[PDB]
């Protein structure tokens, strides 16, 4: 939704008025003129342009562009605009840009990595920031995914689930990943209920797993046949136990004694 003649004012006004889908339409024409003047990313040399011209304006455009991509459920646009902010806030030595000014933008990328169940890049980003014990630990925004994952490592899911519901941070920014992380919690607990819990009625499913509407579990009951009466699990939360595992990875049990004998035959090539 265009507002003024400048493309920057139309994006900032339409950002706080809602309709995040229309904000992504004005993004392509902005980056066309910025890439020709090299104003999209800061240059390594010294052009004597830092906080002036459109480079400071481009700083705000890419900052609000990532927050508008989470409401449209666009994973590529959010990761692209976030990775474009890597030269920002760093540049040369001290800070000429704005990143930590809004600490939610960093947490949105942290919570997005938990949506794919990827802990490799998540735990590494905490070491990327400058002050770990100052801005990261004291601020609850940067510590929001840490405190959320702390109870996951401690094992208690009751307090961790309250951060996505009773918390006040899930209203505006975190609302995009709220239901996504809520789907990630129910995809974690019940994996362990397979071996440990032999049976349980629908009361523990609504309580322990924190499910709201009835018959929605039936939608999770479709394909793999859930007569809940005792244990129907292995549909959700990984899969069945199958049987007869042979000829896949390294050593197996039933049919082949040869690879087992290969360990005894391994000395043939060593001695000869």
């Amino acid at each position: 939704m265009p507002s003024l003649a400048e493309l920057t004012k139309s994006l900032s006004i339409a950002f706080e008025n809602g309709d995040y889908a229309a904000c992504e339409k004005l993004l392509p024409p902005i980056k066309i003129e910025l890439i020709k003047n090299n104003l999209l990313i800061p240059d390594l040399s010294i052009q004597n342009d830092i906080y002036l011209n459109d480079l400071m304006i481009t700083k705000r455009i890419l900052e609000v562009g990532a927050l508008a991509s989470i409401q449209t459920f666009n994973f590529d646009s959010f990761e692209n605009y976030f990775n474009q902010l890597k030269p920002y806030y760093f540049s040369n030595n001290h800070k000429l840009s704005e990143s930590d000014k809004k600490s939610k933008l960093i947490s949105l990328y942290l919570l997005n990595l938990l949506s794919q169940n990827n802990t490799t890049k998540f735990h590494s980003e905490l070491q990327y920031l400058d002050k770990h014990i100052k801005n990261l630990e004291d601020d609850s925004l940067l510590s929001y995914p840490i405190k959320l994952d702390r109870w996951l490592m401690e094992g208690s899911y009751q307090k961790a689930w309250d951060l996505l519901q009773s918390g006040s941070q899930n209203i505006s920014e975190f609302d995009s990943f709220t239901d996504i992380l809520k789907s990630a919690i129910r995809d974690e607990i019940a994996k362990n209920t397979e071996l440990s819990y032999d049976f349980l009625p629908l009361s523990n499913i609504k309580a322990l797993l924190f499910f709201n509407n009835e018959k929605e579990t039936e939608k999770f009951a479709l394909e793999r046949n859930w007569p809940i009466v005792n244990s129907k699990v292995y549909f959700n939360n990984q899969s069945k136990e199958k049987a007869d595992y042979e000829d896949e990875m390294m050593h197996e049990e039933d049919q082949k004694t040869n690879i087992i004998e290969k360990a005894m035959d391994y000395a043939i090539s060593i001695e000869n």
């Binding site: 001290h94 590494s124 702390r150 401690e154 094992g155």
Partner: protein, 475 residues
């Protein structure tokens, strides 16, 4: 007085130079000069203090200077030079001899002596910089020189071992400049430094030099740990470009020390536990390696606490480093005893000490390990224990809180138990008697491969010292 001081050290410098000069001319002897260059670092550092700085002034006058005319003047300008016989051409040790770099053939440009002279000239310059602790402009000025020279000069197999030690001085002098003072031009030097390591590593791949490539990798992996980006280090270690043949004794434990820190945040402690153990065995026990053994042993004790198993606390006592290992004893004691308030008060006072080695971020996550170990201790004692009995021992919150935490322990197969909600007690599912399964064969199959691995190592090493003695004539 001052005249005899300049001729004494210069004669010893040429005496050590002529030893490696004649060996690189015939075929490739480069294995021999590599051993001489190891002791050259220690003999030159002690010699730089004696006879002041005047040993390197007449060395440039002796040989021909391609680039080094203004380098000695700029290096000696910061110290407010006192000029005594400073006119070039005062001391002539050549006097037209073949081993003396005969001048007439050199000045007529009919032969090129610059290859071995100029590459060796940059080595002595970097030694005085680290000895005199010269910083600021003198660090950046020499970087603009050596790097463009290494692109123009094409090093042979013996010549690649020259600059191999120069890349260490470039990164060492750069990190001391950033930590000393923070200026706007600090990171401008690091951007080119990070791009330069990747350009020269591409050329050294075809040279197949063991020391050249292995020296850069440990310097590049340290830069990734400072920035905190695994994505650059993840694909870097997957190619397996690190020569395993000859690292001598320097790079043995340095490579495995980085893999323990990278895999620490990868939540895989199976492979990371072996890398930190191999770094202890490969590291020398001398005093010069104490700086590495201090940080390595502090990392090993932190990895075991992250695994959920209590390590051996006897290392904190019998060792002579226990003065620095005191903060880590109360951490394991708080995790073992399961006291919630003891762990919170321990990391508060020692937080200042944990900032140097950047291990405080891992100590924050040890809060979960207090419950992880506490469940394992109480579970092994009582096979069948009531739900409310755990909350009384550990002073937990409620029964619904412990019900979630116990389910987290058997996730990876640690406790291997089951929770009975209707019965009201947690029962252990481990009946032992694991010998009836294939688990004994799984370990024995590796022991045969590990024994034959040590066989394969001894399989082919004998003839190396026998090449020289059997080919030469014996009495």
């Amino acid at each position: 007085l001052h005249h005899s001081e300049k001729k004494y050290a210069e004669e010893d410098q040429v005496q050590e130079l002529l030893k490696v000069l004649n060996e690189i001319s015939k075929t490739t002897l480069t294995l021999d000069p590599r051993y001489i260059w190891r002791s050259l670092k220690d003999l030159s550092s002690l010699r730089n203090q004696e006879l002041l700085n005047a040993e390197t002034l007449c060395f440039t006058v002796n040989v021909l200077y391609p680039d080094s005319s203004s380098f000695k003047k700029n290096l000696l300008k910061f110290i407010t030079s006192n000029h005594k016989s400073s006119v070039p051409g005062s001391a002539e040790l050549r006097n037209s001899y073949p081993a003396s770099f005969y001048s007439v053939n050199t000045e007529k440009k009919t032969i090129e002596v610059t290859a071995e002279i100029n590459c060796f000239m940059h080595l002595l310059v970097q030694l005085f910089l680290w000895d005199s602790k010269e910083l600021e402009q003198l660090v950046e000025f020499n970087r603009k020189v050596v790097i463009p020279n290494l692109l123009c000069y094409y090093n042979l197999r013996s010549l690649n071992l020259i600059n191999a030690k120069l890349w260490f001085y470039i990164y060492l002098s750069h990190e001391t400049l950033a930590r000393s003072s923070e200026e706007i031009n600090s990171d401008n030097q690091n951007i080119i430094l990070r791009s330069t390591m990747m350009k020269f590593l591409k050329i050294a791949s075809l040279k197949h030099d063991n020391e050249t490539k292995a020296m850069l990798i440990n310097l590049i992996l340290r830069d990734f740990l400072n920035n905190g980006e695994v994505d650059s280090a993840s694909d870097f270690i997957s190619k397996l470009e690190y020569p395993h043949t000859d690292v001598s004794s320097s790079l043995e434990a340095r490579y495995f020390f980085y893999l323990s820190k990278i895999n620490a945040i990868q939540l895989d402690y199976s492979t990371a536990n072996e890398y930190i153990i191999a770094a202890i065995r490969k590291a020398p026990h001398n005093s010069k390696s104490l700086g590495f053994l201090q940080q390595s042993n502090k990392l090993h004790c932190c990895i075991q606490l992250l695994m959920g198993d209590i390590p051996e606390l006897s290392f904190f006592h019998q060792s002579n480093m226990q003065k620095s290992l005191l903060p880590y004893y109360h951490l394991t004691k708080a995790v073992k005893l399961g006291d919630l308030k003891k762990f919170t008060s321990t990391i508060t006072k020692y937080k200042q000490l944990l900032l140097k080695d950047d291990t405080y971020q891992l100590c924050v996550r040890l809060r979960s390990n207090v419950i992880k170990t506490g469940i394992r201790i109480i579970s092994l004692t009582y096979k069948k224990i009531s739900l409310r009995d755990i909350c009384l021992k550990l002073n937990l919150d409620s029964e619904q809180t412990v019900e979630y935490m116990v389910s987290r322990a058997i996730r990876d197969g640690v406790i291997e138990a089951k929770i009975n909600h209707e019965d009201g007690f947690i029962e252990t599912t481990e009946l032992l008697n694991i010998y009836d399964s294939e688990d004994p064969q799984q370990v024995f199959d590796e022991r045969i491969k590990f024994a034959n691995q040590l066989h394969d190592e001894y399989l082919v090493s004998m003839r190396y010292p026998e090449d020289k003695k059997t080919q030469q004539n014996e009495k």
